[PDB]
Amino acid sequence: MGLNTAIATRVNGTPPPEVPIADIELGSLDFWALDDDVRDGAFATLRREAPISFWPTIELVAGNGHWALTKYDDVFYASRHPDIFSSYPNITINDQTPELAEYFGSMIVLDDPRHQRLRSIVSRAFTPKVVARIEAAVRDRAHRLVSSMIANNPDRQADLVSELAGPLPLQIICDMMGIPKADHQRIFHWTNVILGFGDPDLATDFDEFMQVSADIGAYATALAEDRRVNHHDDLTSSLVEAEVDGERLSSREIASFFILLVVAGNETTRNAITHGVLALSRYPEQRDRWWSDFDGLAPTAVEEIVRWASPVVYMRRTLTQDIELRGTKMAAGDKVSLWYCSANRDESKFADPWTFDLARNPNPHLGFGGGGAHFCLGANLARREIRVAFDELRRQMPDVVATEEPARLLSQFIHGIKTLPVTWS
C-alpha cells in the first residue's frame, strides 16, 4: 500500500535502547529475528558488561559453543594473530567438513602457507587489462540496472534488492570472469540456490543444493580449461596464466575461487548497497550532503556505508593454543567468533558511533575484517561497486527513497535485507 511514500526518518546519533544482558541469546534463532536496534543494543551491553562470553550454537546437529569477541581491540588482535586464531577449515560458527569447506571457501578456509600461495597467485591475476575490464563492467552494469529500473516501472516503484543490489555484484563477477550472457541464467540459478542455503525461511532441497554445487564447479573448471587454449582479456584467462615462483593454479582451484566469489563477493556488496539506501532514506541530510559533492565525499561515504551496514556480521576462528584475553581463559580447540557488527560501534574506537556520518575520518572500521592475512581481497572492487551504484542512483533518480521497512534475512552471519521497496521521481 504505502509503497509510494518514504519511510520514517530517524534522528541521527540516537543510541539503541538499553538491552538487559538476560535478554541476549546469541544461540537462539529468535534473537536473530529481533530488529537491528535490539541487536545493536545487545552488543552494546556485551561490550560494556561482558565483552568476552561463551554461547551455544544455534541448532536446527548442535555443535560446540563459541567465545564471542565484541570489542574492536579483541577482534583486531584475533585477526592479526592467525597462528593462534586459525581459519582452517571453518570460518562460520557451525562446523563443516574440511573437504566441503575448501570446495566452497577456497583461500578463506586456509592458513599459511597454503593460504598465501593461493592468494598470491590469484592477486597476480588482476593484471592491468583485467582491472580495466572490471572497472568498465562495474559502470556498465550499474548504469544499465538503474536505467532498467526506470524502464521497467511506470509506477516508479521497485524493489532495490531484486532490481539493483542483487544482480549488480553477480553480473560484474560474470563479466570479470568472461562468462557469456547466455550463461547468466544458469549461473544466477546455481548461485541463488547456494545462497538460499543461508536463509532458513527459504526451503533448500539438499540434493538440489549438492547438484548445483557440482554443476557450478564443473562449469568454472571447463571455463578455465577453455582459457588455457584461448587467452581472452578476462580474469579466468589471467588466473590460468598467473605464476608466483613457478607455482600455478589448478582448474579445480580456479573453480573453488569462483564459488567463493559468487557468495563472498556478491551478497556482501548487495547488502552494503541496500543498507546504504536505507541509511540515506533514514538520514536525508547525509544524502543531501553527498549529492552536493559526490566525488569529494565518496571516499569517506563509502567507508561509512560499510561500517554502518557491516554486511559480514562475524567471522569465526579456532584456537590452536590456550590464550587468556581480558581475564577470560579460552582453550586450544575452542571456537571464537569475531563480531565486526559490534567492533563497528565500539565506543572506545569511534567518536559518536551511533552517528551515520558520510564525512567520517578517520574510519578504521572492521567491515572488511580486522586486517592481516585474510583482509578482504575484493575490498577495492567492493568500494568501487558501492560508489558507482550510488553515483548512478544520484545521476538517474536522485530522490530515490525506501518506502517500506526492509524485510530482514534471518541470519547470524549475513546482515541481509531480502526486499527494500523504493520510489523516485
Ligand code: HEM
Ligand atoms: C561490501 C562488500 C564486502 C565485505 C563487507 C566483505 C567482507 C569480507 C570479510 C569480513 C572477509 C574476511 C576477512 C578476514 O577474515 O580477516 C572477506 C574475505 C574475502 N573477500 Fe570480501 N567482502 C566484500 C566484498 C568482496 C568482493 C566484491 C570480493 C571479490 C569480488 C570479495 C572477495 C573476498 C575474498 C577472495 C576473501 C578471502 C580473502 C582471504 O581469505 O585471504 N569480497 N571479505
